[PDB]
Design a protein around this ligand. Structure first.
Ligand SMILES: [Ca+2]
Ligand SMILES: [Ca+2]
Ligand SMILES: [Ca+2]
Ligand SMILES: [Ca+2]
Lengths: 97, 95
């Protein structure tokens, strides 16, 4: 847990996904309803107030690459990687350098 | 010039037309003009990522009206989305 923080990160990546994907419908994929709870309860700093729905449909449409109205674990990792790639750039001072 | 927030509004309008008037519609960006604007005007936004498949995804994620182009409205939405994100790390997102 503490002796390997990078391992604990991969745990909460798989567990947080299934924390909501199994609430309704396909137990292995996130619908628009489950994508809303996961981002709200687990990534609160990312959203802010938000709740524009249309932008949520845009976010749901951008993540859903295969166009099946769901977010599988593949697209779930791409979205997290895109956020981490930004956290890396702003660590290097993107808007100020 | 004298006011920085004013020049910020001026550069966003001029930078858009700095590339939109090159090919086709004079007021809408195509995929080539969008790539010139991102690489030349926002280099640190994309760390020299050359993935054409991923660049097309950003092109479709911005083309909200599905006209294969990026007008000024979608140009402002994308810039505000970036600015809103800069704000989160300023305040302290994973930190
Ligand atoms: Ca589900
Ligand atoms: Ca999907
Ligand atoms: Ca054009
Ligand atoms: Ca458009």
């Amino acid at each position: 847990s503490m002796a390997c923080p990078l391992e604990k990160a991969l745990d909460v990546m798989v567990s947080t996904f299934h924390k909501y994907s199994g609430k309704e419908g396909d137990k292995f994929k996130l619908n628009k309803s489950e994508l809303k709870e996961l981002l709200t309860r687990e990534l609160p700093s990312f959203l802010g107030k938000r709740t524009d729905e249309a932008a949520f449909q845009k976010l749901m449409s951008n993540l859903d690459s295969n166009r099946d109205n769901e977010v599988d674990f593949q697209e779930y990792c791409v979205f997290l990687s895109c956020i981490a790639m930004m956290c890396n750039e702003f660590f290097e001072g993107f808007p100020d350098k």
